[PDB]
Amino acid sequence: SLYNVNGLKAQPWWTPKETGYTELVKSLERNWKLIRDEGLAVMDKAKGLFLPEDENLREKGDWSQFTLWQQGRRNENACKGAPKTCTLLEKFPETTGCRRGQIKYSIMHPGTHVWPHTGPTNCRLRMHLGLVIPKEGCKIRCANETKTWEEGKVLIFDDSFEHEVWQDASSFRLIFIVDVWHPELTPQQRRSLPAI
Ligand code: NI
């Protein structure tokens, strides 16, 4: 990709400790219900704050997002929708300042499959916080390892690896997606790398 930095540690799945972003992960997991509740509050389509997720192609099913940060820019109207979550995230420039990432609620509905794909850059890691996870039917593969989400828990993967998602439940799957700068990027790089 045009948006890669050579030599950045490359592995499909990361532990929180490996990323060094332990305070961010702890805060996400401490406050998971608070974050979930704000997502649920605006989740009404009648409200209509969740919009289609066109980030990548899906074979079938429905997929929606409510984006709080985009390329390091706070969505003001969105944060009025999720004020406590936004206030919380502001403590963590490693994600709010990630100009190559996003911060968003992501809902995936029953009968959805997202084709194998890669993100645009090896310069971010993608955190998933489980908010509402169906008992069965949802999973995500990254490279050769397939995993499931857990409510209140963070998964972290390098989405520049090929990954793929299935929603084979009967009820919706809500997660919170938090992108961070790859931890081996210098402060100079975090300041100067053009957004994507
Ligand atoms: Ni993806």
Numbering used by the authors: 563 to 758
Question: What did the article's authors report about this structure?
Answer:
Here, we report crystallographic and biochemical results on the structure and substrate selectivity of AspH. The results reveal a key role for the TPR domain of AspH in substrate binding and, unexpectedly, that the preferred EGFD-substrates of AspH have a non-canonical (Cys3–4) disulfide pattern. Whilst the oxygenase domain fold of AspH is typical for the 2OG oxygenase superfamily, details of its active site and the role of the TPR domain in EGFD-substrate binding are remarkable. Whatever the precise extent of conformational changes during catalysis, the results reveal a central role for the TPR domain in enabling AspH catalysis—without it, 2OG turnover occurs, but EGFDs are not hydroxylated.
However, no hydroxylation of hFX EGF139mer was detected by mass spectrometry (MS). Using a [1-14C]-2OG based assay, we observed AspH-Ox catalysed turnover of 2OG to CO2 in the absence of substrate, demonstrating oxygenase activity, albeit uncoupled from substrate hydroxylation as precedented with some other 2OG oxygenases under certain conditions. A structure of the AspH oxygenase domain (AspH-Ox) was determined with Ni(II), substituting for Fe(II), and with L-malate (from the crystallisation buffer) bound in the predicted 2OG binding pocket. As expected, the AspH-Ox structure is comprised of 8 β-strands forming a double-stranded beta-helix (DSBH) fold, with its active site located at the more open end of the β-sandwich. In contrast to most 2OG oxygenases, the active site metal is only coordinated by two histidine residues (His679, His725), located on DSBH strands II and VII. Two water molecules and a malate molecule complete octahedral coordination of the metal ion. Overall, the Asp-Ox structure validates the expected DSBH fold with intact Fe(II) and 2OG-binding sites, consistent with the observed 2OG turnover. In the AspH-Ox structure, the side chain of Glu617 appears to mimic the Asp103hFX side chain interactions with Lys666 and Arg688, possibly reflecting a function for this residue in protecting the active site from oxidation in the absence of substrate.
